[PDB]
Design a protein around this ligand. Structure first.
Ligand SMILES: Cc1csc(CNc2cnccc2C(=O)O)c1
Ligand SMILES: [Co+2]
Ligand SMILES: [Zn+2]
Length: 330
């Protein structure tokens, strides 16, 4: 067995190896990368996503979300309060203001300490889930807007044609903006490129130990658990590394910097936070190995989870028994 300790692996493809996405994901898995639930990929030194980021200020953040915390420093939920629209230019200026700017700190470790100690006492604003892309159309390799669709993967593997399209999203972040503990919709893979700005710290639980985290979550968030049998899909719960360690949950951490890709693997629970103003782009994807995870993925049927048009068909084909009750909830 490759990577038995489930360590987060970091890859440095050559430009030749960077020319076939599916092949390289398969290679990473041949080295056991998926066992961690998350891998970093540093692109070839000659590669770039686009020429410059000089003309991105006019992008609109239609619904910025203020992330309000409730609970204890190391165990809390967050809810998203909708705010008025603003451009990326206005958002960047807000992120850099005295109220929201990254505080003085010695290094990544000091900032992480400050995050977990102080996160709940501030409500940062996140420009999340914005449909669009910052990859240049002429960028041929690892262009997140030119990946094969999950619908085409499902068709190629199962022989059924289905409706739906698969497009990327942009995430404009600031200090303390937070992504809660979750796996992807249908336990798909995700790929995340940090286009610009300050880093993004990630925490991840190995897929083979995902149920340990779920068990702990049920204990730490008893109300949320009773209301929905798959409440982590609401993407509201945070649990600090100190609390994970106290409860024996196996996990790893890694910081992603601008110009680097992260891939999350099927049923790899992850969470994290932004260090300061940044912009990331992400999309879900699938491989042949995902299919069996899709068939087993838990569903939120209480209506709280954000349901996309594309998800209907994946539940319909892969989880026909769940389809009726799931459709009632959403
Ligand atoms: C509405 C909303 C708030 S946080 C979120 C999901 N974000 C992520 C999910 N998986 C990985 C990384 C991120 C991220 O933020 O980089 C959606
Ligand atoms: Co994710
Ligand atoms: Zn639910």
């Amino acid at each position: 067995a490759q990577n038995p300790n489930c360590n987060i692996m970091i890859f440095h493809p050559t430009k030749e190896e960077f020319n076939d996405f599916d092949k390289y994901i398969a290679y990473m898995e041949s080295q056991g990368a998926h066992r961690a639930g998350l891998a970093k990929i540093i692109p070839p030194k000659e590669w770039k996503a686009r020429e410059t980021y000089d003309n991105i200020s006019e992008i609109l953040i239609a619904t910025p979300l203020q992330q309000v915390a409730s609970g204890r420093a190391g165990v809390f939920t967050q809810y998203h309060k909708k705010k008025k629209a603003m451009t990326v230019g206005e958002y960047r200026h807000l992120a850099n203001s005295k109220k929201y700017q990254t505080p003085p700190h010695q290094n990544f470790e000091d900032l992480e300490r400050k995050y977990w100690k102080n996160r709940i006492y501030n409500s940062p604003i996140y420009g999340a889930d914005i449909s669009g892309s910052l990859f240049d159309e002429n960028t041929k390799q690892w262009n997140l807007g030119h990946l094969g669709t999950i619908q085409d993967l499902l068709e190629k593997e199962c022989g059924v044609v289905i409706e739906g399209v698969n497009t990327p999203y942009l995430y404009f972040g600031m200090w303390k903006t937070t992504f809660a503990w979750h796996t992807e919709d249908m336990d798909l893979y995700s790929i995340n490129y940090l286009h610009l700005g300050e880093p993004k710290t990630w925490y991840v639980v190995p897929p083979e130990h995902g149920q340990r985290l779920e068990r702990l979550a049920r204990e730490l968030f008893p109300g949320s658990s009773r209301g929905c049998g798959a409440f982590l899909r609401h993407k509201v719960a945070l649990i600090s590394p100190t609390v994970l360690k106290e409860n024996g949950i196996p996990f790893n951490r890694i910081t992603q910097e601008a110009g680097e890709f992260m891939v999350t693997f099927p049923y790899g629970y992850h969470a994290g936070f932004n260090h300061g103003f940044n912009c990331a782009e992400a999309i879900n994807f699938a491989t042949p190995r995902w299919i069996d995870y899709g068939k087993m993925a838990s569903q939120c049927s209480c209506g709280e989870a954000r349901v996309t048009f594309s998800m209907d068909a994946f539940v319909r084909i892969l989880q026909p028994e769940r389809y009726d009750l799931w459709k009632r909830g959403q």
